[PDB]
Amino acid sequence: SLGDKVIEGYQLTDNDLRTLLSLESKEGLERLYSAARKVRDHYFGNRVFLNCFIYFSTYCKNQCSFCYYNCRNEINRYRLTMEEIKETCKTLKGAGFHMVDLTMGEDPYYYEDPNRFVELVQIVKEELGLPIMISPGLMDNATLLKAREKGANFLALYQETYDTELYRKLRVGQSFDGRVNARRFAKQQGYCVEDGILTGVGNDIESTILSLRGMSTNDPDMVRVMTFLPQEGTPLEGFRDKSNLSELKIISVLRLMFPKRLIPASLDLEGIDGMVLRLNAGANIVTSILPPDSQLEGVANYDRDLEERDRDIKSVVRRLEIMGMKPARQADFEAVL
Ligand SMILES: C[S@+](CC[C@H](N)C(=O)[O-])C[C@H]1O[C@@H](n2cnc3c(N)ncnc32)[C@H](O)[C@@H]1O
Ligand SMILES: C[C@H](CCN)[C@@H](N)C(=O)O
Numbered sequence: 001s002l003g004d005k006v007i008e009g010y011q012l013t014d015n016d017l018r019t020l021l022s023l024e025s026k027e028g029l030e031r032l033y034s035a036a037r038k039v040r041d042h043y044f045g046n047r048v049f050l051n052c053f054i055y056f057s058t059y060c061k062n063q064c065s066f067c068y069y070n071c072r073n074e075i076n077r078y079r080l081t082m083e084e085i086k087e088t089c090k091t092l093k094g095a096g097f098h099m100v101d102l103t104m105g106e107d108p109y110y111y112e113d114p115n116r117f118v119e120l121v122q123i124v125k126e127e128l129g130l131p132i133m134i135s136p137g138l139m140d141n142a143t144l145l146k147a148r149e150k151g152a153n154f155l156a157l158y159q160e161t162y163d164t165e166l167y168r169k170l171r172v173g174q175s176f177d178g179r180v181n182a183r184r185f186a187k188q189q190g191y192c193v194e195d196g197i198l199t200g201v202g203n204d205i206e207s208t209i210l211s212l213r214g215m216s217t218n219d220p221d222m223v224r225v226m227t228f229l230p231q232e233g234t235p236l237e238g239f240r241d242k243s244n245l246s247e248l249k250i251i252s253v254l255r256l257m258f259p260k261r262l263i264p265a266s267l268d269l270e271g272i273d274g275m276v277l278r279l280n281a282g283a284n285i286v287t288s289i290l291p292p293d294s295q296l297e298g299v300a301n302y303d304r305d306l307e308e309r310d311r312d313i314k315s316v317v318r319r320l321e322i323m324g325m326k327p328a329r330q331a332d333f334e335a336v337l
């Protein structure tokens, strides 16, 4: 009945969030996943959207405590040349993606002269013609406006948490309202916006509710949750979370809270097997799919130690077929834009 109630317009209360978020039993969790699939199937059927991830520069000037690419970490870093971007684009044409996500750290090269980023968006839009999600960090409003004019469609700029006590330990040195304000500015210029929270990073149930309610206030087009994977060389490298607040539970709660929105199943956390679990918890778009071949990186990189990664669209679509799901039509995706 819970899925039916939501389909009809029921708004989950804070008591409902507490109850859903504290579910621990196999049967309870299966009833929560089933409810979220009812809601997702009502609005999306068995059709799934596919987003390619192009991490085009792994340089960052910021010092996030959770992220492998924080500026204090002495690691391998790359910055794709124009020729490498064009070669990557050639491998994506006609592959079946609905959108491409052009992501970078806050790379000083692109921040010193943001016309270099605007030209990168123009080249990719000219090559692919597809909807483009940008994840450039907190770029200034003038650059956001120029990138919109070159064909950027989505801005992904995740808040991580709306619990202020936690945000300042995670996004060290970054304004809390700066990110909120940039998503608002981008919506005014016509972008769709994705917000996101991290779980497994010391958020308890109350912190998670504050973050779910914080995400809803701004009317995002896409909402996500990622499991924190502690990374080598960061301040949080040893962190162990003592919580039941799994990404799958929160995906189902997001579907019940944002029934009509996009919610990702990311390959970056648990790969294709993890994708199955996330789609069965209510997700409707598969992200962190890499270009065919590709030495390109994800962000959490659950598969950093594997001799062979399984991140390509053809493996994703094969697994959706096994699940009884199918890629969506492009026009259905464009309807969200
Ligand atoms: C793809 S965005 C990068 C864009 C730009 N640098 C930024 O911070 O907005 C990185 C996000 O990846 C996720 N992330 C980073 N490190 C992670 C980790 N160790 N585990 C899980 N998610 C992580 C976070 O939600 C952070 O918002
Ligand atoms: C975190 C990344 C996305 C950033 N906008 C990508 N690895 C993902 O999981 O979708």
Ligand code: SF4
Pocket: 060, 061, 062, 063, 064, 067, 068, 069, 070, 071, 104, 105, 106, 137
């Ligand atoms: S999350 Fe984004 S801003 Fe923070 S260190 Fe990682 S790449 Fe840089």
